[PDB]
Amino acid sequence: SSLSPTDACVHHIKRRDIVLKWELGEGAFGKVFLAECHNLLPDKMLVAVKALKESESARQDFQREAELLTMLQHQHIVRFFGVCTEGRPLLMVFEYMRHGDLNRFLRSHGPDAGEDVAPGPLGLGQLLAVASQVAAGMVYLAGLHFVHRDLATRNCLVGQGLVVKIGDFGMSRDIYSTDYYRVGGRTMLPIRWMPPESILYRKFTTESDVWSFGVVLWEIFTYGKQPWYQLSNTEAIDCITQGRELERPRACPPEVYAIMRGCWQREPQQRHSIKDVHARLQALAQAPPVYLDVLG
Numbered sequence: 001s002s003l004s005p006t007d008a009c010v011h012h013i014k015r016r017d018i019v020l021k022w023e024l025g026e027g028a029f030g031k032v033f034l035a036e037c038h039n040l041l042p043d044k045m046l047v048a049v050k051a052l053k054e055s056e057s058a059r060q061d062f063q064r065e066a067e068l069l070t071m072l073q074h075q076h077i078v079r080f081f082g083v084c085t086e087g088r089p090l091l092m093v094f095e096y097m098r099h100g101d102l103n104r105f106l107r108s109h110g111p112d113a114g115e116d117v118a119p120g121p122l123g124l125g126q127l128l129a130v131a132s133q134v135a136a137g138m139v140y141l142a143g144l145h146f147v148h149r150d151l152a153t154r155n156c157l158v159g160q161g162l163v164v165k166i167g168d169f170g171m172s173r174d175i176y177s178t179d180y181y182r183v184g185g186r187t188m189l190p191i192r193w194m195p196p197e198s199i200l201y202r203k204f205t206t207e208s209d210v211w212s213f214g215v216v217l218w219e220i221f222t223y224g225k226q227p228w229y230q231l232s233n234t235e236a237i238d239c240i241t242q243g244r245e246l247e248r249p250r251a252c253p254p255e256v257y258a259i260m261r262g263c264w265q266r267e268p269q270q271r272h273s274i275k276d277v278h279a280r281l282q283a284l285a286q287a288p289p290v291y292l293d294v295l296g
């Protein structure tokens with residue numbers, strides 16, 4: 001549902017092939033469970049199961065989302081296995097990502113906090129690895145002409161081997177409620193990640209995702225701090241619209257902060273493409289230690 005363009009295709013899983021283990025999360029739209037899934041890939045494997053709470057308007061929303069998610073298969077997008085529509089509750093089956101959402105992972109590996117990561121805070125090399133993978137997922141979505149309306153580290157997942165993919169199970173507005181500004185009745189906007197053209201003109205395009213990615217880049221180098229944490233929602237809105245930019249994080253080298261600033265050009269057309277932002281981050285991520293050691 002977070003995607004916006006700028007039933008036979010859907011894979012089905014028998015309810016007996018899904019064995020719920022325990023709850024992983026809960027939101028306003030449903031629950032997430034860890035489950036054992038049989039004969040999904042050639043004997044048994046762990047999966048995250050999103051259960052839809054309750055309804056005919058929601059059943060068609062579920063069907064369209066499943067169709068969209070089926071089309072969306074890539075190396076840096078959380079894997080969607082299919083649905084279970086034989087009875088209630090309707091289920092969506094996704095791969096299980098061991099380390100949870102990227103915001104939680106960053107926070108637990110920051111100075112304020114070991115199979116996949118070294119002790120202490122994440123090094124420059126791993127922060128750039130994380131950033132490059134998120135950018136790679138955005139390059140793919142932009143390439144399919146899809147806009148992600150809620151790009152943030154809370155909406156990315158981390159798996160075994162520090163593999164980072166875009167995806168979430170729809171509970172961010174519940175788990176990370178302070179990351180949203182409540183408006184017109186029930187609507188909640190991720191204002192701190194939104195560019196000036198979204199706040200002012202209610203426009204959200206591929207260039208608006210480059211801006212949101214720059215905020216994601218800032219979250220990474222601050223180990224998951226909330227952008228504009230010192231400010232209330234209206235003060236954050238004033239900053240974004242008046243052109244005040246987030247400051248260079250302590251752990252962020254000037255070369256990386258240059259990439260962030262390039263994402264935050266006021267005019268959408270002046271922002272670099274996500275393809276270029278990715279290219280610059282991957283070049284830094286795979287750069288020899290000798291080079292990276294003289295950056296920061």
Ligand SMILES: Cc1ncc(NC(=O)NCc2ccccc2C(F)(F)F)c(-c2ccccc2)n1
Nearest residue numbers: 001002003029065072077078166167168169170
């Ligand atoms: C109410 C509500 N708000 C937000 C949601 N989150 C999204 O749409 N996230 C996008 C997403 C999710 C899973 C995998 C991949 C992606 C994407 F598009 F980035 F490639 C969902 C959601 C509805 C279906 C499946 C799960 C999440 N539901």
